[PDB]
Amino acid sequence: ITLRKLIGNINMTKEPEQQSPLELWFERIIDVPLEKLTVEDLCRAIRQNLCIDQLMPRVLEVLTKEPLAGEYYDGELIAALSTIKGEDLKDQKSTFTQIRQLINQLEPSDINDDLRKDILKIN
Amino acid sequence: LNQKQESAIKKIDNTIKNALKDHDIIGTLKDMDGKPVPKENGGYWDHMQEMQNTLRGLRNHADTLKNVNNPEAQAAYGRATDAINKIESALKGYGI
Amino acid sequence: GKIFEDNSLTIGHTPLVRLNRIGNGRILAKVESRNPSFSVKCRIGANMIWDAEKRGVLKPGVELVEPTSGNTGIALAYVAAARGYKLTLTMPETMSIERRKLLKALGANLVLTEGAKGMKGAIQKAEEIVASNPEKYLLLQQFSNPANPEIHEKTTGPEIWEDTDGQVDVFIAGVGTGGTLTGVSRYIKGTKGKTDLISVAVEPTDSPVIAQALAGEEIKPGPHKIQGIGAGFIPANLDLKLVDKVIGITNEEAISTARRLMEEEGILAGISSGAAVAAALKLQEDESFTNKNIVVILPSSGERYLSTALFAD
């Protein structure tokens, strides 16, 4: 399953010569199913509020293998999750709390510690 | 005087210099002006949030390398602060 | 009676309006869009040129130059038009067509610089223009020019004092150049000796450099959406010795509070106005400020931003 299947094409319809970097990027990953999205793509889709609901399963597996997964810096995925609004956790409300558990068990962090705090104040 | 995974962080600065495109900055500024790119669902793309992420990575990796007594690492540090200055110079004073 | 000799002399005497549905009834909003070019910068556009005249630097043939993408550009445009000066504004090419039209209609000459270079490119070009003939061109330098806070010590401050009969307890102002906060504080604390006054600076949470400066931290600015404040550095016209407290406001607190001002108070408001009011509301959840008179600066009107995301529902 892919982002096109969940939300369709949410781009304002226009020719690629008239598209912004995020509009362009979204057209490059919209047919990419969730299970293969790179880490960079995953963080950005979260940051950009792109059906975060159905992304949680993929996030849950990327972190178990590497809790500080990220492209631009270590911990970027946790940083992106910090931006979630709790209300858009519809049917994966359960999968989120599974993630919070893995996150609330760590030692090395810094300006990430407030993000980990911000994650815990969304319900 | 010799590196470890500061290597894994000198590489991330230089390849983050394919996230400093002109339109990456210009999108950030137009967000600052209150003209973000609308989606069709309602709501907007947030280009200045991507720029904040880029600043955070560059700032973090420059800290990693700040006091590393090694030439290769100090070169990457100068490139990271040249790029941070490049971004800061575009925004400082904007909109006033 | 009073007949003004040109439009620059009409600045000030802006109303102080009580907020009834926002807060507890003790927030007083000074509406600085009631000004010749409809922002607080009208005051500094006037006095900065008055001061240049008084200093003799502005003479036959001398032209004005400033880099600005904001309300200072509009303020300088109407004053130069009112008093017969030639103005060149340097500014990024990200500026909208509609904003260019507003300035050209006020007679300003526009120099658009490369978009990705941002504000520094506009600052550089203005410096290169003055370097091409320093005797012909004069740079106003809104961030360092002490004529900026001088007009708030001579006008904005006194108006707040007179209107409140000295019973202002807190003064809240978002900081762009720092002039408003500096002069108003400098008048009330110095000239009238109310050292009790609590002066509050407002800045964005996403570029909190004033808070960084008072902690000795390194200055790390970023992009924000509170247009008009949040310069990303501590301008020379910000006197940190007078800042008692600094409140960071999020993008989303400023937008919604500005929209509350419009729908709940009938005061057209921009983002920076919503942010200053949001800071007053945050101060009032501390019960030590529950019974204090809070005067807040509202720098511009929302109609100037009618094209922006401020109007999304």
Side-chain angles (χ1 to χ4, degrees), chain A residues 10 44 47-48 72-73, chain B residues 39-40 46 50 53 61:
Chain A
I10 63 179
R44 185 170 299 117
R47 284 200 299 276
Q48 298 301 324
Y72 294 90
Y73 52 95
Chain B
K39 304 168 177 182
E40 231 177 46
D46 196 328
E50 297 303 307
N53 192 65
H61 296 312

Side-chain angles (χ1 to χ4, degrees), chain C residues 4-12 35-37 41-50 53 75-85 151 155:
Chain C
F4 299 92
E5 284 318 304
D6 65 53
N7 211 19
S8 83
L9 291 158
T10 59
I11 65 163
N35 259 313
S37 69
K41 291 309 205 314
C42 292
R43 298 171 118 110
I44 82 175
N47 195 62
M48 224 160 288
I49 284 175
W50 296 342
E53 297 171 340
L76 289 167
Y78 94 89
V79 175
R83 301 178 75 81
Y85 294 109
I151 195 57
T155 65

Side-chain angles (χ1 to χ4, degrees), chain B residues 38-96:
Chain B
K39 304 168 177 182
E40 231 177 46
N41 76 293
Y44 302 85
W45 300 104
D46 196 328
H47 289 82
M48 83 167 250
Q49 187 180 359
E50 297 303 307
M51 194 51 80
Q52 300 172 204
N53 192 65
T54 296
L55 267 179
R56 177 168 173 170
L58 287 172
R59 275 172 176 150
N60 169 17
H61 296 312
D63 280 348
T64 298
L65 304 179
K66 186 168 199 164
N67 316 304
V68 172
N69 183 241
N70 164 7
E72 209 198 329
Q74 289 310 110
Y77 179 77
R79 298 182 251 121
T81 75
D82 287 334
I84 294 180
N85 292 340
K86 162 178 172 73
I87 300 168
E88 295 187 354
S89 283
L91 318 176
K92 296 196 305 177
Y94 193 67
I96 306 186

Side-chain angles (χ1 to χ4, degrees), chain B residues 6-61:
Chain B
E6 320 151 330
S7 279
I9 284 196
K10 146 150 184 160
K11 155 147 45 174
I12 296 207
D13 310 357
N14 287 142
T15 49
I16 282 177
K17 274 81 150 192
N18 71 35
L20 288 177
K21 308 298 188 185
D22 278 8
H23 282 183
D24 282 341
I25 297 167
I26 281 158
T28 296
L29 289 174
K30 297 309 300 171
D31 276 19
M32 291 195 65
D33 289 321
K35 311 287 278 293
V37 180
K39 304 168 177 182
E40 231 177 46
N41 76 293
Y44 302 85
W45 300 104
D46 196 328
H47 289 82
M48 83 167 250
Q49 187 180 359
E50 297 303 307
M51 194 51 80
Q52 300 172 204
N53 192 65
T54 296
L55 267 179
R56 177 168 173 170
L58 287 172
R59 275 172 176 150
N60 169 17
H61 296 312

Side-chain angles (χ1 to χ4, degrees), chain C residues 92-126:
Chain C
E93 57 197 359
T94 52
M95 163 173 292
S96 72
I97 297 310
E98 273 200 10
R99 181 57 77 77
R100 306 167 185 198
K101 284 177 172 172
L102 181 62
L103 298 174
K104 262 184 284 161
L106 289 167
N109 275 95
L110 315 173
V111 172
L112 302 154
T113 60
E114 263 181 42
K117 294 185 173 170
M119 198 58 186
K120 197 204 195 166
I123 297 171
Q124 285 173 331
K125 183 86 184 176

